[PDB]
Amino acid sequence: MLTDPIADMLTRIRNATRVYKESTDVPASRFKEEILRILAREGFIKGYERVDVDGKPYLRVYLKYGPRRQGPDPRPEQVIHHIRRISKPGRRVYVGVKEIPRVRRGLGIAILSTSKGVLTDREARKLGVGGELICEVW
Amino acid sequence: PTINQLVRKGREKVRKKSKVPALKGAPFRRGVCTVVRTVTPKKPNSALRKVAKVRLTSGYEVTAYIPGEGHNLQEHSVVLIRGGRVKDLPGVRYHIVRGVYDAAGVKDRKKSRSKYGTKKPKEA
RNA sequence: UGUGGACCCGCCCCUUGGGGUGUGUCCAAAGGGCUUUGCCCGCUUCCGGAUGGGCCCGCGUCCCAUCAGCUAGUUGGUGGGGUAAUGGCCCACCAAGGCGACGACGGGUAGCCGGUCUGAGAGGAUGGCCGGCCACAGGGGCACUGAGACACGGGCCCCACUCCUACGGGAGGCAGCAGUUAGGAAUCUUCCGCAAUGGGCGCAAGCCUGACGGAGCGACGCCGCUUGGAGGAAGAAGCCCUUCGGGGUGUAAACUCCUGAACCCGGGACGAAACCCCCGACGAGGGGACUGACGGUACCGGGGUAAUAGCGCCGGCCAACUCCGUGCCAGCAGCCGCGGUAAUACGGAGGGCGCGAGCGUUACCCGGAUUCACUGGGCGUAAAGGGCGUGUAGGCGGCCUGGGGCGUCCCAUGUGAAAGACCACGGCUCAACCGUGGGGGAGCGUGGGAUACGCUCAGGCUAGACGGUGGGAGAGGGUGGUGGAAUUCCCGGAGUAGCGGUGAAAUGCGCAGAUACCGGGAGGAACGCCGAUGGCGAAGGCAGCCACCUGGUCCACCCGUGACGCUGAGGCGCGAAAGCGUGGGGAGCAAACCGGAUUAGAUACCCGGGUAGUCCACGCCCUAAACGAUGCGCGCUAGGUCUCUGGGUCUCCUGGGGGCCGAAGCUAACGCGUUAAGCGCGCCGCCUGGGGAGUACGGCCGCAAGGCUGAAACUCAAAGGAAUUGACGGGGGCCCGCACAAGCGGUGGAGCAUGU
RNA sequence: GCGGUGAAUACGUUCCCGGGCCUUGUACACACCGCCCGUCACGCCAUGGGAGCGGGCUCUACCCGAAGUCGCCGGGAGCCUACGGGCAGGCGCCGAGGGUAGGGCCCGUGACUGGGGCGAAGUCGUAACAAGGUAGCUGUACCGGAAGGUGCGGCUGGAUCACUUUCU
RNA sequence: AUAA
RNA sequence: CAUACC
Ligand SMILES: NC[C@@H]1O[C@H](O[C@H]2[C@@H](O)[C@H](O[C@@H]3[C@@H](O)[C@H](N)C[C@H](N)[C@H]3O[C@H]3O[C@H](CO)[C@@H](O)[C@H](O)[C@H]3N)O[C@@H]2CO)[C@H](N)[C@@H](O)[C@@H]1O
Ligand SMILES: [Mg+2]
Ligand SMILES: [Mg+2]
Ligand SMILES: [Mg+2]
Ligand SMILES: [Mg+2]
Ligand SMILES: [Mg+2]
Ligand SMILES: [Mg+2]
Ligand SMILES: [Mg+2]
Ligand SMILES: [Mg+2]
Ligand SMILES: [Mg+2]
Ligand SMILES: [Mg+2]
Ligand SMILES: [Mg+2]
Ligand SMILES: [Mg+2]
Ligand SMILES: [Mg+2]
Ligand SMILES: [Mg+2]
Ligand SMILES: [Mg+2]
Ligand SMILES: [Mg+2]
Ligand SMILES: [Mg+2]
Ligand SMILES: [Mg+2]
Ligand SMILES: [Mg+2]
Ligand SMILES: [Mg+2]
Ligand SMILES: [Mg+2]
Ligand SMILES: [Mg+2]
Ligand SMILES: [Mg+2]
Ligand SMILES: [Mg+2]
Ligand SMILES: [Mg+2]
Ligand SMILES: [Mg+2]
Ligand SMILES: [Mg+2]
Ligand SMILES: [Mg+2]
Ligand SMILES: [Mg+2]
Ligand SMILES: [Mg+2]
Ligand SMILES: [Mg+2]
Ligand SMILES: [Mg+2]
Ligand SMILES: [Mg+2]
Ligand SMILES: [Mg+2]
Numbered sequence A: 001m002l003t004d005p006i007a008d009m010l011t012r013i014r015n016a017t018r019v020y021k022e023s024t025d026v027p028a029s030r031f032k033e034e035i036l037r038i039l040a041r042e043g044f045i046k047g048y049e050r051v052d053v054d055g056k057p058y059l060r061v062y063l064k065y066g067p068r069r070q071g072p073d074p075r076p077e078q079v080i081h082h083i084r085r086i087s088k089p090g091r092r093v094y095v096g097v098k099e100i101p102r103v104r105r106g107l108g109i110a111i112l113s114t115s116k117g118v119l120t121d122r123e124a125r126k127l128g129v130g131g132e133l134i135c136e137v138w
Numbered sequence B: 001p002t003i004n005q006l007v008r009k010g011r012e013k014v015r016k017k018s019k020v021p022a023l024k025g026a027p028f029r030r031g032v033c034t035v036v037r038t039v040t041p042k043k044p045n046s047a048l049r050k051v052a053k054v055r056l057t058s059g060y061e062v063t064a065y066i067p068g069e070g071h072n073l074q075e076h077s078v079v080l081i082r083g084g085r086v087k088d089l090p091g092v093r094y095h096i097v098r099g100v101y102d103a104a105g106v107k108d109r110k111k112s113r114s115k116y117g118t119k120k121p122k123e124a
Numbered sequence C: 001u002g003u004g005g006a007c008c009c010g011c012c013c014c015u016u017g018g019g020g021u022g023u024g025u026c027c028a029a030a031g032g033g034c035u036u037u038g039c040c041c042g043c044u045u046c047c048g049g050a051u052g053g054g055c056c057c058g059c060g061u062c063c064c065a066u067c068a069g070c071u072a073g074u075u076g077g078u079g080g081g082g083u084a085a086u087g088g089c090c091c092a093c094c095a096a097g098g099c100g101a102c103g104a105c106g107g108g109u110a111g112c113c114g115g116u117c118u119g120a121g122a123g124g125a126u127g128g129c130c131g132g133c134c135a136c137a138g139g140g141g142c143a144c145u146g147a148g149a150c151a152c153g154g155g156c157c158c159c160a161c162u163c164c165u166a167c168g169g170g171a172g173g174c175a176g177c178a179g180u181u182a183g184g185a186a187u188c189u190u191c192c193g194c195a196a197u198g199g200g201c202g203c204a205a206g207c208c209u210g211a212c213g214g215a216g217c218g219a220c221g222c223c224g225c226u227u228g229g230a231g232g233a234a235g236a237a238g239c240c241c242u243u244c245g246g247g248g249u250g251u252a253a254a255c256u257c258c259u260g261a262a263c264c265c266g267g268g269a270c271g272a273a274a275c276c277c278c279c280g281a282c283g284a285g286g287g288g289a290c291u292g293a294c295g296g297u298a299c300c301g302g303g304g305u306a307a308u309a310g311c312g313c314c315g316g317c318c319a320a321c322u323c324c325g326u327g328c329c330a331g332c333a334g335c336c337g338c339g340g341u342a343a344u345a346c347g348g349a350g351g352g353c354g355c356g357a358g359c360g361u362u363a364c365c366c367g368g369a370u371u372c373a374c375u376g377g378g379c380g381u382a383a384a385g386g387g388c389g390u391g392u393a394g395g396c397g398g399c400c401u402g403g404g405g406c407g408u409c410c411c412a413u414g415u416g417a418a419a420g421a422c423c424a425c426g427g428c429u430c431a432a433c434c435g436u437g438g439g440g441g442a443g444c445g446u447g448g449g450a451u452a453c454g455c456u457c458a459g460g461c462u463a464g465a466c467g468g469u470g471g472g473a474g475a476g477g478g479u480g481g482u483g484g485a486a487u488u489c490c491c492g493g494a495g496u497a498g499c500g501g502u503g504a505a506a507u508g509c510g511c512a513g514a515u516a517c518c519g520g521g522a523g524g525a526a527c528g529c530c531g532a533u534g535g536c537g538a539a540g541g542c543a544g545c546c547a548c549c550u551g552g553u554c555c556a557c558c559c560g561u562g563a564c565g566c567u568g569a570g571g572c573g574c575g576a577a578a579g580c581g582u583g584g585g586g587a588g589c590a591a592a593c594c595g596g597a598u599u600a601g602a603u604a605c606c607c608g609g610g611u612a613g614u615c616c617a618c619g620c621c622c623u624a625a626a627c628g629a630u631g632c633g634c635g636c637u638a639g640g641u642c643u644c645u646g647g648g649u650c651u652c653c654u655g656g657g658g659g660c661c662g663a664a665g666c667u668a669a670c671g672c673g674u675u676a677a678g679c680g681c682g683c684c685g686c687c688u689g690g691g692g693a694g695u696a697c698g699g700c701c702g703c704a705a706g707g708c709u710g711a712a713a714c715u716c717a718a719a720g721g722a723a724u725u726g727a728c729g730g731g732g733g734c735c736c737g738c739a740c741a742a743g744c745g746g747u748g749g750a751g752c753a754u755g756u
Numbered sequence D: 001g002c003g004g005u006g007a008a009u010a011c012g013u014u015c016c017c018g019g020g021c022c023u024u025g026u027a028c029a030c031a032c033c034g035c036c037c038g039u040c041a042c043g044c045c046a047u048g049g050g051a052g053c054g055g056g057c058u059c060u061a062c063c064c065g066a067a068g069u070c071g072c073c074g075g076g077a078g079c080c081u082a083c084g085g086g087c088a089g090g091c092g093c094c095g096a097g098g099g100u101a102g103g104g105c106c107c108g109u110g111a112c113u114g115g116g117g118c119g120a121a122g123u124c125g126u127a128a129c130a131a132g133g134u135a136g137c138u139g140u141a142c143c144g145g146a147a148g149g150u151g152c153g154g155c156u157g158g159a160u161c162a163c164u165u166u167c168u
Numbered sequence E: 001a002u003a004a
Numbered sequence F: 001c002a003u004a005c006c
């Protein structure tokens, strides 16, 4: 079965971008969606939208890359350089507000889930909470 | 392994067995010579090597090496051993202190004097 | 006497034995001193405070599972005893419980902590000075007295040891300060003082303190300080090297002047102002007196001498090279390694490098070691995927909504002693050392809040999973049956001199007629072609044909259930071959064995025989190169091509399976690449340098053979994987050469010449 | 060095010796006159099994049992008394330790004995690495001075294929 | 035979 | 090259 559906998405995305797709489909959940809301806001995607494949509900993510490059290998720079699940099943990772990590000196984000809802690193620290550290993205 | 496995079992820490049971831990140990011998090296070495079988206040019978060109140890000489394998004679792990007990300091030695244990050549 | 307290019973409040209240009963005392009618110190009962304790609880606290079962006061009940007090703390009676893989029970090791060392940190190691708690006082028990002891310098008893002994009997207890002795690599004075601080008793004066404050020994550690400072040759002597010119030690020395550690003389402490005494009141307050172990020390002033330098190193790692001696010796060596007659690696010398009242060595801890990896590793070939399944516990778990608020997060608050650690300002001339202040702090307690994610409870869903209906391919498994080819043997026929076998042979078979050939028969075993580029199975493995019994699977329909899922320590089953037990069988083949060859030998390869075995049934054994040397599940990430098997609009589309090539990507490389070794998540298993060793031991299993589990001493600096360039092969392919072959003349014999 | 006279034979590349290029395997690199294996001999070392001796700890049953608390008695059977009672003494439970029987574990010692690991130049062969000259390795079974050989089955981590031919 |  | 044995 699908043991972690968040990693599934996070990965689904990582996979798609490395072959430069225009978009990719993840099967849908509000929680998954509530993450894409942030990916989108912070500039990591072009955004997403609830499409509908074979009558079951998916979230089409629209990916985003650099410009074409120079010399041999013109494949463009990735926008999502790096994106990885931190907390996982059978190793949940929770942090105090005093422990929310500075990712790449802030050049990257770290989505975490708090009782004020899903939030970036900057968001929670400048709002006073902590929670389950979901994933770093940079 | 999986975390649940580290949880279940865990990492086992490493035991570090001594290279030198001069018991006590102690820096040195006294014993008596119960034979002085000559020994052949191995590998690409050849020479005649001075060793002793010592019986220790540790209650241990170990074979020590007798450094220096000149030595004065006999089949009843008391001696102080001190750890320091000799790379060429297998099973020789301790050295003998030159300058302590029956063992004489090396004679007319002028350089590495405190190993070998010789006084300070005196004049003006 | 009864302020008041204690006890029984009743009543109120409270909620565990807390606080009232009524009757009844029970329970108090001690005197001493004077400045002698009032003070000082005592005594008695009760309530409260302070300080110190007892007991109980949550959580945390090393190693071995080669220690898996443990327990009879054991687990709970009732009633007692006991205590300051709860309690199987102890006792009687009753119930039959309690604990354990979240590691009981046993074994091993250990005082625990604040802290200490190390580390970027997470971690690792440690618990020595100092402070807190615990335990012990020759070993084992025990109580007495007390507010407190089961009592280190108190009591009793038993034990071991030393001592006295008139033979019956007694006496001891440094793990208090010193000190002796023993063991050891190794650890101090039988010092001074109660002046300060603290303690005990005393109204006080005082007394007692080996607590303590000081001195003493040891470079054992830290910190501070000296062995001098400025001039001084184009550069003495000696020693060193040399290209025979020189170059080095080197401004170093000598020597010129300048300060003046040591040492001498003089002054000389702080630490000490209280207790006591006087005025006031024996209060507040004021006045007075006494007191220094350290110590004639610290410190201040004058006088004043050029006045200890060692140890390690110099092949690379690793700062620093030249002669001589040695000759695989003598030796060095942390690792790699130096020495075999020209050694920057050995021993000396000159020179040089590094530290310096120290410098080296050995031992031990952390580090580098992401080398037990949580941070932060791996397992196709380097060590590592369990032989395969089924499944227990456990771990983990799709989408939507609501409750709760266990996890998680947040606010407030309590606790986190001092020392130490961090920072500042201070005191010793600095520092070491010490004083003052500030700051931080993991973790636990409480009160309030959040609800995304995890958890749980209640509903809902169909996309995971299972089911239904129709259809398919298959050496998947079990049982009975049956078919032809061959080998062997037996009978008959015909036929005669050999057959067989090898490099060559022999052993062997054959005139009792073999070999070849024909016909008939018995049997045991295995199934040619079809047939692999194939199929089936979880693995081991599975192939003549027929029938029955029976397992897995794939597709179409999108019909039903509604998260029923994944993985899986133990358990249970399965598991080529060989091997074992009991019967059966036995054609061919064939360990052992018996012969023939070969050979230097030939306990082998070759040849002729041949027993177990190979086959069956039943029962064991449980292994393997049990291999894709690649655990299972799910999701994602170009394509091309070949093939097996479904379905559909059937140039092709769409599933499942088997190959090859390759995108991205990965990999040490080789390789892998929708049948991952890519990108991810869940779970199990396993690895931690080589040898010793799959050994020993213990356990468990087996009839056995053995299997499973599985070390240590000791020992090495490697062992390894992939690839590269060579060389090589009794590997391939291509090709040369008087290389052979084809030729013609020689040498090897003779006599002599010449060389050895 | 010089001229005179003046031949034979070569089918062919299988063998013998060398050499070049390409390819394959490799455990070789002072490079096959390479590497390497095991028994055995000499020597040093740690160690398993072990009849029997010496010592420690613990458990079970039975018996003896100091001190001491606690319990019962405390009597014309001792002392005290206010007659209530106290004390002395006595018995008993428990109880340190001791002994008899059986068992479990831990250390020393040890006749005899099994293998191990190391140590330039002792011995026998030549198993492995090239198709290592009989592909190798492997589980198992028997056999042999030794490496090893053979059976059966498995693996490829085997070169791809025409009498034995050891060592450097 | 052994070491380079 | 320097060694070791028959
Ligand atoms: N350590 C070797 C072990 O024993 C064997 O090897 C041992 C013996 O077989 C071997 O003996 C060899 C011998 O083969 C060879 N032909 C001659 C050689 N002189 C011997 O060597 C032995 O003996 C001499 C003295 O005689 C020693 O100086 C030398 O160090 C030692 N290795 O010496 C070894 C002991 O050092 C196994 N083959 C080996 O697998 C195993 O590892
Ligand atoms: Mg050392
Ligand atoms: Mg030296
Ligand atoms: Mg009253
Ligand atoms: Mg009353
Ligand atoms: Mg009450
Ligand atoms: Mg009452
Ligand atoms: Mg009264
Ligand atoms: Mg009076
Ligand atoms: Mg109190
Ligand atoms: Mg009971
Ligand atoms: Mg009670
Ligand atoms: Mg009770
Ligand atoms: Mg225990
Ligand atoms: Mg202790
Ligand atoms: Mg600690
Ligand atoms: Mg580290
Ligand atoms: Mg101490
Ligand atoms: Mg201490
Ligand atoms: Mg003592
Ligand atoms: Mg005493
Ligand atoms: Mg001594
Ligand atoms: Mg005093
Ligand atoms: Mg005092
Ligand atoms: Mg000067
Ligand atoms: Mg002066
Ligand atoms: Mg002067
Ligand atoms: Mg006084
Ligand atoms: Mg007065
Ligand atoms: Mg006053
Ligand atoms: Mg001078
Ligand atoms: Mg250098
Ligand atoms: Mg010269
Ligand atoms: Mg010599
Ligand atoms: Mg020389």
Ligand SMILES: [Mg+2]
Pocket: none
């Ligand atoms: Mg040389």
Ligand SMILES: [Mg+2]
Pocket: C344
């Ligand atoms: Mg030198």
Ligand SMILES: [Mg+2]
Pocket: C345
């Ligand atoms: Mg050196």
Ligand SMILES: [Mg+2]
Pocket: C367, C368
């Ligand atoms: Mg470091």
Ligand SMILES: [Mg+2]
Pocket: C369
């Ligand atoms: Mg580490």
Ligand SMILES: [Mg+2]
Pocket: C377, C378
């Ligand atoms: Mg590793």
Ligand SMILES: [Mg+2]
Pocket: none
């Ligand atoms: Mg291998």
Ligand SMILES: [Mg+2]
Pocket: none
């Ligand atoms: Mg391997």
Ligand SMILES: [Mg+2]
Pocket: none
């Ligand atoms: Mg497998």
Ligand SMILES: [Mg+2]
Pocket: none
């Ligand atoms: Mg197994």
Ligand SMILES: [Mg+2]
Pocket: none
């Ligand atoms: Mg295996």
Ligand SMILES: [Mg+2]
Pocket: none
């Ligand atoms: Mg399963």
Ligand SMILES: [Mg+2]
Pocket: none
């Ligand atoms: Mg389950």
Ligand SMILES: [Mg+2]
Pocket: none
């Ligand atoms: Mg669950």
Ligand SMILES: [Mg+2]
Pocket: none
């Ligand atoms: Mg969920």
Ligand SMILES: [Mg+2]
Pocket: none
């Ligand atoms: Mg909910």
